[PDB]
């Protein structure tokens, strides 16, 4: 069963991966861009709120 | 002097009962079949501490009932109703514990919230019928001249009652619940002892006595001395003085304040009290 | 020979992931303003379950949600009016998962019976009973009205075809009992965490494991997928929640505190991805700022442990289901 494991590890060995800085910047940009349409982050006005 | 201690008693009763009621109401985990009876008992003790005790303290200190005769009769009826409701609710709680311990498999079927509401309502209707109906319809009115003079004058109020009503009220309020509670708690003590012996026999390698001692001792030492003299003063006219009667009545009143300290102590109730305070 | 090659490959993976660490996420994020205190109050409390609840799933309309409990019943609520639209009895009393189809016509459930039951709401009979899993099911999700993905305790995840009722493909090579599963918004990929610390990323169409993340130390009880589609946060039993990145291949941040020592049972993300809401065994949920790993609030209305947590597609409401058989919807 070691052959399957080593083959899987070899398959997972070579993937083009970006630097952590770029990924963190992308996540920050996504969080900032869509922050306006977040009822939980910014409380919705009492009017048009479905529950209250 | 006397005003300070009575005010403290009123404050303690009201505070404890409102804490118990709000702890049951606010927290959903505290709502249980037994806790419905606990809530009924707390409501009885709270209406006690609100109407029965402050008015009695005012009557004692002022030495005159400044309120109307109708208000005097209403206060007496509320007093009887609260006392009998509290004692019968204690009896119902004892019966619920007895049914939970003695017959555990059928306890779930026997006790239900819908059925518990019926039990509480029946207890309160019995209390109402035994308190309001005879007093308001003036069936408790005595016949001797002293009672006529006391009740004719609206300035002063003292409890003068017939032999029949006094005996019936005592039996309905205390003695029958006393018998029921003594029987059921002797039984649950017997199962507790048997379970302790079984545990000792299985795992060879006190608490029930203390708990039942508190539960029965506070109730007996609070209400039995009052009801003995309640019967006696009817049996012998000159045996019991008014001051002793009132003192024992207030000793019985203090049971309402003492009651949450013994019936509402538990990890869940302690946590709820800590959260509220 | 083979073991030495595997060890060398693992060392190569560790070295490659080390070289990608240009800067920690906290270093970049510390400049941006904090979210601030977040206060959420229970708007709706859903009552009617007898025993403990394990799973819930918000409908695509954000109006209907389905909850599963050990009662053997699958109650479908209406969150706005607090009305039970359907109450589906189940053949097996023990269930551990539930799902809501995107179309709203189908609902699935599963548990210790090793069988995934799919119910047809619009017709509440059992549309199909899916058998083939050796162990208990832990989580189910709907790709479409015909494809369902189930994660079981036999250390294998499977993709079924509802009409055919057979495993179209089986995801193997996982060393622990899979506990939670989540889908990408494009439904091309999905992730799964198991008892073993590693959490894997799969490809639905091909059926192979693209990537593996092993940052945790204990059982992976919960998993959620970032709305962007390039990250996913896992909740484990070691009182830590960690944010992994598919493109970076290693963790970015670790959400934990010394005060809390209980495991995490359910995790979810807000619509913008800023707030990571995680359930806990310490009887209440925590709201984590996903960007700075700073807690923003608590949800302390539950009496028993929180077993499931979810956020509506519209993002308006957060519903948590606990073991006290009470569903509470926060906002």
């Amino acid at each position: 069963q070691a052959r399957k494991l080593v083959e899987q590890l070899k398959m997972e060995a070579n993937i083009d991966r970006i630097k952590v800085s770029k990924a963190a910047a992308d996540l920050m940009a996504y969080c900032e861009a869509h922050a306006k349409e977040d009822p939980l982050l910014t409380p919705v006005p009492a009017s048009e709120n479905p529950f209250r | 002097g006397m005003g300070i201690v009575m005010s403290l008693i009123v404050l303690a009763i009201v505070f404890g009962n409102v804490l118990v009621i709000t702890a049951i109401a606010k927290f959903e985990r505290l709502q249980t079949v037994t806790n419905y009876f606990i809530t009924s008992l707390a409501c009885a003790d709270l209406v006690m501490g609100l109407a029965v005790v402050p008015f009695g303290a005012a009557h004692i200190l002022t030495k005159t009932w400044t309120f109307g005769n109708f208000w005097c009769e209403f206060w007496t009826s509320i007093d009887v109703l609260c006392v009998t409701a509290s004692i019968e609710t204690l009896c119902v709680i004892a019966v619920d514990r007895y049914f939970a311990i003695t017959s555990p498999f059928k306890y779930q079927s026997l006790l239900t919230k819908n059925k518990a509401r019926v039990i509480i309502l029946m207890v309160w209707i019995v209390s109402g019928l035994t308190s309001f109906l005879p007093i308001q319809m003036h069936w408790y009115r005595a016949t001797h001249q002293e009672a006529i003079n006391c009740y004719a004058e609206e300035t002063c109020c003292d409890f003068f009652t017939n032999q029949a009503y006094a005996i019936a009220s005592s039996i309905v309020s205390f003695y029958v619940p006393l018998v029921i509670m003594v029987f059921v708690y002797s039984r649950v003590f017997q199962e507790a002892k048997r379970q302790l012996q079984k545990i000792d026999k299985s795992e060879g390698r006190h608490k029930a006595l203390k708990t039942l001692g508190i539960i029965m001792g506070t109730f007996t030492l609070c209400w039995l001395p009052f009801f003995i003299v309640n019967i006696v003063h009817v049996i012998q006219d000159n045996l019991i003085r008014k001051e002793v009667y009132i003192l024992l009545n207030w000793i019985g009143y203090v049971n309402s304040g003492f009651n949450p300290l013994i019936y509402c102590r538990s990890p869940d109730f302690r946590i709820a009290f800590q959260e509220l305070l | 020979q083979l073991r030495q090659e595997a060890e060398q490959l693992k060392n190569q993976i560790r070295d490659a992931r080390k070289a990608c660490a240009d800067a920690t996420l906290s270093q970049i994020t510390n400049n941006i303003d904090p979210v601030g205190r977040i206060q959420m109050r229970t708007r709706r409390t859903l009552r009617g379950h007898l025993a403990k609840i394990y799973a819930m799933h918000w409908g695509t309309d954000s109006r209907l949600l389905v909850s599963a409990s050990q009662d053997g019943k699958l109650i479908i609520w209406d969150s706005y009016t607090t009305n039970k639209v359907h109450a589906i009895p189940l053949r097996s009393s023990w269930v551990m998962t539930c799902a809501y189809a995107p179309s709203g016509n189908y609902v699935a459930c599963g548990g210790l019976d090793n069988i995934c039951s799919i119910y047809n709401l619009k017709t509440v009979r059992v549309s199909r009973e899916l058998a083939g899993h050796t162990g208990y099911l832990s989580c189910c999700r709907f790709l479409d009205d015909n494809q369902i993905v189930t994660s079981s305790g036999d250390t294998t995840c499977a993709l079924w075809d509802i009409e055919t009722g057979q495993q179209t493909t089986t995801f193997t090579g996982h060393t622990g009992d899979v506990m939670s599963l989540s889908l990408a918004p494009d439904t091309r990929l999905f992730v799964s965490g198991a008892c073993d610390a590693s959490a894997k990323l799969w490809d639905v169409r091909e059926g192979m494991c693209r990537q593996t993340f092993t940052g945790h130390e204990s059982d992976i009880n919960a998993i959620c997928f970032f709305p962007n589609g390039n990250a996913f946060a896992t909740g484990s039993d070691d009182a830590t929640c960690r944010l992994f990145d598919l493109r970076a291949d290693q963790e970015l941040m670790t959400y934990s505190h010394d005060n809390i020592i209980c495991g995490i049972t359910s995790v979810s993300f807000s619509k913008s991805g800023r707030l990571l809401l995680a359930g806990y065994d310490d009887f209440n949920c925590n709201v984590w700022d996903a960007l700075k790993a700073d807690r923003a609030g608590v949800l302390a209305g539950h009496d028993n442990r929180v077993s499931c947590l979810g956020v509506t597609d519209d993002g308006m409401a957060v519903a948590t289901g606990s073991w006290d058989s009470f569903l509470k919807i926060w906002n």
Partner: protein
């Protein structure tokens, strides 16, 4: 939109009535978990992916949910059985020498794991020591002594307060009580009165097992109620 709301409210009322009926049904029954070892003899007991057996005694409904297969050392599913009335544990007391660590030691480890579980910090365990006849045959006639596989047996002496069978040998009673005490030590060490262990010596031919389970469940609920009111 009022008609739709009224219809939905009527559906809610019907569902609530059905839920109340099912609530009465659910509270009526008692749930038990059978968690014996494969060799211990779960089949013999259950004769009198998950197997459910519904048996009622004295108008009390018991449901015994015995997990089938799922042969995993790690037991995540055990947290599901947090509300069961009792956990019925079946152990083969005649397997003190079988290796397929010994079987008895594996059962001891499993019992210790069940006892020391955060979710099972209240659930009591009913212990059945099956295959009593085989244990007696091995101890009496067999040349393999339990002392070799259990070193602590040498210093062990039979309890003064014991209940030997009407026709039973001394040495086999010593062995049986030692095997019982092995589980009882684990039972007594951890649990501080919330849950207890009920060790019963079961034989394959015994038919009173249902009565034993009924009595043990009654004792469990009685002790739970007594401890709730601080009477024990």
């Amino acid at each position: 939109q009022r008609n739709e709301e009224k219809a939905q409210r009527e559906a809610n009322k019907k569902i609530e009535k059905q839920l109340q009926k099912d609530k009465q049904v659910y509270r009526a029954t008692h749930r038990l978990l059978l968690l014996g070892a494969g060799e211990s003899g779960k089949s013999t007991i259950v004769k009198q992916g998950i197997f459910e057996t519904k048996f009622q005694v004295d108008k009390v409904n018991f449901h015994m949910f015995d997990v089938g297969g799922q042969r995993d050392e790690r037991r995540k599913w055990i947290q599901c059985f947090n509300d069961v009335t009792a956990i019925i544990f079946v152990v083969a007391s005649s397997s003190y020498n079988m290796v397929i660590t010994n079987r008895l030691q594996e059962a001891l480890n499993l019992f210790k794991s069940i006892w020391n579980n955060r979710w099972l910090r209240t659930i009591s365990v009913i212990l059945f020591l099956n295959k009593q006849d085989l244990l007696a045959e091995k101890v009496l006639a067999g040349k393999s002594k339990i002392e070799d596989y259990f070193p602590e047996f040498a210093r062990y002496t039979t309890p003064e307060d014991a209940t030997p069978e009407p026709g039973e040998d001394p040495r086999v009673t010593r062995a049986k009580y030692f095997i019982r005490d092995e589980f009882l030590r684990i039972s007594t060490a951890s649990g501080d009165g919330r849950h207890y262990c009920y060790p019963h010596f079961t034989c394959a031919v015994d038919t009173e097992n249902i009565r034993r389970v009924f009595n043990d469940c009654r004792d469990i609920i009685q002790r739970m109620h007594l401890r709730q009111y601080e009477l024990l």
